Amino acid sequence: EEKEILWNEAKAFIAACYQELGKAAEVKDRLADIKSEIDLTGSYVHTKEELEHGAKMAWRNSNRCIGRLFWNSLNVIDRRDVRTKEEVRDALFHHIETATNNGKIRPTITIFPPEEKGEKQVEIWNHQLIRYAGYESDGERIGDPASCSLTAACEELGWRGERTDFDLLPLIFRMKGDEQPVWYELPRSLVIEVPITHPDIEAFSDLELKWYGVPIISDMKLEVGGIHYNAAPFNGWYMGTEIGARNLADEKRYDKLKKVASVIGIAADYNTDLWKDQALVELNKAVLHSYKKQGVSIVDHHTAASQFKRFEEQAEEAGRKLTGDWTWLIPPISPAATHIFHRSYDNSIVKPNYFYQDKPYE
Amino acid sequence: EEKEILWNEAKAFIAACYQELGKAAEVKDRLADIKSEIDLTGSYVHTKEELEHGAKMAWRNSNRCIGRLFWNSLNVIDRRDVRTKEEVRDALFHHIETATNNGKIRPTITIFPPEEKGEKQVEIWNHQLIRYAGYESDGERIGDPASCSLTAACEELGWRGERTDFDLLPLIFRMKGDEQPVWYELPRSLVIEVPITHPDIEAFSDLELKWYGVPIISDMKLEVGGIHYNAAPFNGWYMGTEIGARNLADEKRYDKLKKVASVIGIAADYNTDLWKDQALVELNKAVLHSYKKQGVSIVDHHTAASQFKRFEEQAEEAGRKLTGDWTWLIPPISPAATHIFHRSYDNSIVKPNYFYQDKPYE
Numbered sequence: 001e002e003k004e005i006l007w008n009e010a011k012a013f014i015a016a017c018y019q020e021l022g023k024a025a026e027v028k029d030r031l032a033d034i035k036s037e038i039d040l041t042g043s044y045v046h047t048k049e050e051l052e053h054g055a056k057m058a059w060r061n062s063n064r065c066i067g068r069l070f071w072n073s074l075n076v077i078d079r080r081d082v083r084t085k086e087e088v089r090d091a092l093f094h095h096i097e098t099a100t101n102n103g104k105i106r107p108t109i110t111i112f113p114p115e116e117k118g119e120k121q122v123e124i125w126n127h128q129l130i131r132y133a134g135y136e137s138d139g140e141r142i143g144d145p146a147s148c149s150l151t152a153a154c155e156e157l158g159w160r161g162e163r164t165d166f167d168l169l170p171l172i173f174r175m176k177g178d179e180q181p182v183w184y185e186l187p188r189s190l191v192i193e194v195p196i197t198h199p200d201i202e203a204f205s206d207l208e209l210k211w212y213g214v215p216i217i218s219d220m221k222l223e224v225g226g227i228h229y230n231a232a233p234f235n236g237w238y239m240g241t242e243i244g245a246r247n248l249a250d251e252k253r254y255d256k257l258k259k260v261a262s263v264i265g266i267a268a269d270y271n272t273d274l275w276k277d278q279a280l281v282e283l284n285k286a287v288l289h290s291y292k293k294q295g296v297s298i299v300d301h302h303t304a305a306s307q308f309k310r311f312e313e314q315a316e317e318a319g320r321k322l323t324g325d326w327t328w329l330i331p332p333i334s335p336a337a338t339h340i341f342h343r344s345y346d347n348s349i350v351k352p353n354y355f356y357q358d359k360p361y362e
Numbered sequence: 363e364e365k366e367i368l369w370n371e372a373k374a375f376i377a378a379c380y381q382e383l384g385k386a387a388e389v390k391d392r393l394a395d396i397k398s399e400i401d402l403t404g405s406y407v408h409t410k411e412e413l414e415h416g417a418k419m420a421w422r423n424s425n426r427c428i429g430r431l432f433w434n435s436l437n438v439i440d441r442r443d444v445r446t447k448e449e450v451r452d453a454l455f456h457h458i459e460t461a462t463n464n465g466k467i468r469p470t471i472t473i474f475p476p477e478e479k480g481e482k483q484v485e486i487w488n489h490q491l492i493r494y495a496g497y498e499s500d501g502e503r504i505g506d507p508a509s510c511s512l513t514a515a516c517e518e519l520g521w522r523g524e525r526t527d528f529d530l531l532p533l534i535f536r537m538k539g540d541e542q543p544v545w546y547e548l549p550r551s552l553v554i555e556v557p558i559t560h561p562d563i564e565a566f567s568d569l570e571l572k573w574y575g576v577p578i579i580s581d582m583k584l585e586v587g588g589i590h591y592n593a594a595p596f597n598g599w600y601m602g603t604e605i606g607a608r609n610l611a612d613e614k615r616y617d618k619l620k621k622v623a624s625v626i627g628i629a630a631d632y633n634t635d636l637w638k639d640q641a642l643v644e645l646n647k648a649v650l651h652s653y654k655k656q657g658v659s660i661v662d663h664h665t666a667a668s669q670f671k672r673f674e675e676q677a678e679e680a681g682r683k684l685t686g687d688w689t690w691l692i693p694p695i696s697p698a699a700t701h702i703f704h705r706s707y708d709n710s711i712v713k714p715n716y717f718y719q720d721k722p723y724e
């Protein structure tokens with residue numbers, strides 16, 4: 001029943017993967033071994049080659065990702081050998097340091113042991129490995145509202161935030177067999193942050209905005225050939241609009257546009273003045289400038305779309321169908337100035353891929 | 363076969379329309395008369411009430427339109443009585459004058475006789491009643507590229523444009539029974555145009571940009587209760603981004619962003635400077651300012667989205683399902699600053715509605 005779904009996914013994945021690696025001759029014997037491994041054990045184990053190419057294919061198939069041109073240079077770290085919470089913690093610390101790479105960000109994924117019988121071996125509670133806490137009590141909002149429920153769960157576990165607007169959440173995860181997760185403070189030496197300044201407007205630093213260097217998404221499931229890697233944190237570098245048009249701008253996040261309008265010296269009184277739009281552009285210019293000034297990788301949305309056009313061209317040249325989610329591929333700033341806006345994309349789901357999964361808290 | 367599709371659409375429309383007008387008692391007898399009219403004649407004729415409410419319902423059901431809050435105040439002009447090309451021309455001139463209303467634009471639709479057996483009585487060739495010509499020969503681009511094929515068709519018919527960037531195309535339409543359409547120059551006294559200036563930047567007038575006041579879309583088919591009104595030009599007022607983010611900005615339209623960047627004094631050299639985004643905001647601010655200064659109706663995209671939220675609320679309160687096309691409802695400038703971006707919409711097609719139809723030329 002599960003052995004069948006597994007075997008089917010395995011056949012489809014091994015054939016495609018080995019074809020891409022020029023190993024098509026070896027498919028028959030590999031499939032043989034897998035068939036017997038599933039019968040005898042209920043699952044099968046990927047070779048390091050399969051796992052690495054699977055994680056790359058999964059990125060290539062992520063419909064909502066504009067950054068896919070670089071799928072084949074993903075740095076895959078195989079941590080299927082971890083058994084203890086100290087090993088998990090150290091692997092997550094390592095991922096941070098190696099992905100950060102002193103600012104020259106390396107797209108990286110660390111892959112932990114996969115689910116067995118739907119039973120997780122390691123369950124990561126963080127949304128990203130580096131993320132700010134959020135607090136909301138009696139009229140008072142502090143930090144990142146998107147982090148309120150995770151922050152409250154951490155404080156249930158004896159963590160306590162300083163209640164600045166930028167408290168770093170601890171790493172928090174649970175091991176199989178433990179009733180409760182454990183948490184560990186992030187060593188500050190590992191976390192690069194960027195203060196936001198503006199190239200022309202000196203007063204912009206008065207807002208005391210900053211953001212962290214590397215987004216390391218840690219709550220998605222990587223599925224490859226029927227094997228479910230629920231713990232497999234990965235990162236790229238930011239596209240600037242994620243920080244400037246959403247994290248710092250959204251009313252339900254840091255909600256900074258009125259403050260930006262004031263420091264750039266425009267009124268925030270009339271919709272027809274387009275002050276939100278002007279403030280968005282200046283905040284986004286500041287974000288790109290600040291990351292560049294500090295030597296931390298970042299891409300602007302025009303360059304990102306130009307790279308994505310090359311991804312489309314490369315897909316066609318390779319004879320692979322392109323899939324994509326137009327609603328997520330268009331940037332939230334000047335979308336009609338990118339080619340993405342003016343074409344359509346087939347939003348079909350192809351595996352290997354990355355998937356949402358239920359939060360373990362809340 | 364056609365009588366059946368017709369009767370079915372008629373039943374569904376009359377029931378809904380009379381329910382909305384509180385006339386539900388009259389449905390049975392009206393349906394009786396319609397049934398007999400279809401049998402004996404192959405079609406049926408709407409009452410003036412049905413036609414007016416049908417055109418309003420069709421606007422209310424237009425998934426891609428952000429301006430729908432005002433659906434019930436559509437001004438419906440019934441021109442089912444026209445038989446001659448002089449009457450058509452005069453009705454189109456009249457629509458322009460009454461919709462323009464000296465700048466205080468009235469949303470209006472003029473409805474011409476409907477198709478008989480799929481046979482058009484009047485076939486309008488213009489995309490909008492007021493639109494600029496476009497020319498493209500040997501490296502030289504003049505005017506609006508989107509108008510190139512219609513412009514060439516007009517010049518086949520003995521029209522000749524002055525080849526400015528803003529030549530007004532003639533009205534062009536064909537009567538049933540004529541092999542060729544006729545064309546008529548627009549009287550300049552009927553056409554309001556707005557020069558684009560910027561509230562703060564004096565040099566912006568150097569670009570010598572202008573646009574026309576009223577968009578009167580004249581190539582869509584209005585379908586109401588199975589009756590096909592292929593000729594039924596309608597207008598609202600502009601949302602500013604249509605002019606500033608698309609008509610004047612698109613590379614395949616007037617392509618003005620590099621020129622805007624230069625007059626606003628920013629470099630157009632580096633994607634990371636976000637110069638296209640900054641130029642877009644300034645051009646859009648100029649457009650709203652210029653229309654307002656001249657007393658010509660226009661709405662900015664924030665206010666438009668706020669009105670659309672009220673449309674959603676009104677639909678819910680009335681017990682009607684809301685339908686919408688998220689990809690067209692989001693504005694092309696700061697879309698994530700509107701509520702539209704953050705919710706989803708059911709893109710189902712409900713009739714009465716407005717539909718694309720095949721161009722009669724090209």
Ligand code: HEM
Pocket residue numbers: 055059062064065066067068070074107108109234235236237238239242299304328354
């Ligand atoms: C190299 C730099 C990268 C850039 C600039 C980039 C850019 C983006 C952006 C802008 C989004 C939209 C998310 C949002 O709007 O919040 C996105 C979505 C996504 N990216 Fe990438 N990305 C990169 C690398 C990666 C990598 C390395 C992976 C995995 C190996 C990945 C997988 C995804 C996935 C799965 C989504 C969709 C997430 C969801 O549905 O919530 N990306 N990417």
Ligand code: HEM
Pocket residue numbers: 417421424426427428429430432436469470471596597598599600601604661666690716
């Ligand atoms: C009162 C002011 C109005 C505003 C501000 C408005 C705004 C808009 C906008 C911005 C669009 C998107 C089109 C584009 O991006 O190029 C649109 C689409 C549309 N509007 Fe409205 N609209 C208004 C009135 C009307 C009226 C009076 C009707 C018909 C009675 C109408 C029917 C439509 C239709 C059918 C579409 C979709 C056209 C297509 O698929 O190409 N609108 N509207």
Ligand SMILES: CN(C)c1cccc(CNCc2ccc3ccc(N)nc3c2)c1
Pocket residue numbers: 127146215217235236237238239242
């Ligand atoms: C809480 N919140 C705002 C949230 C919650 C769940 C999912 C998301 C969307 N995740 C966006 C995402 C995923 C992968 C990325 C890889 C690289 C990159 N630059 N951005 C990514 C953004 C948000």
Ligand SMILES: CN(C)c1cccc(CNCc2ccc3ccc(N)nc3c2)c1
Pocket residue numbers: 489508577579597598599600601604
């Ligand atoms: C040539 N071109 C750019 C084109 C061709 C066909 C269809 C369209 C989209 N029409 C947009 C439209 C329709 C109705 C409107 C009513 C009011 C308003 N302010 N804008 C409208 C825009 C474009």
Ligand SMILES: C[C@H](O)[C@H](O)[C@H]1CNc2nc(N)[nH]c(=O)c2N1
Pocket residue numbers: 326341342343344689690691
């Ligand atoms: C195919 C693709 O979705 C297409 O470019 C659409 C996107 N949404 C749009 N939205 C508006 N308002 N106008 C357009 O012309 C388009 N084009």
Ligand SMILES: C[C@H](O)[C@H](O)[C@H]1CNc2nc(N)[nH]c(=O)c2N1
Pocket residue numbers: 327328329688703704705706
């Ligand atoms: C439901 C609705 O489509 C939703 O708000 C989407 C739109 N597209 C998006 N695109 C990105 N990049 N990020 C988002 O959070 C969303 N939200």
Ligand SMILES: [Cl-]
Pocket residue numbers: 215242247
């Ligand atoms: Cl983020």
Ligand SMILES: [Cl-]
Pocket residue numbers: 577604609
């Ligand atoms: Cl237009």
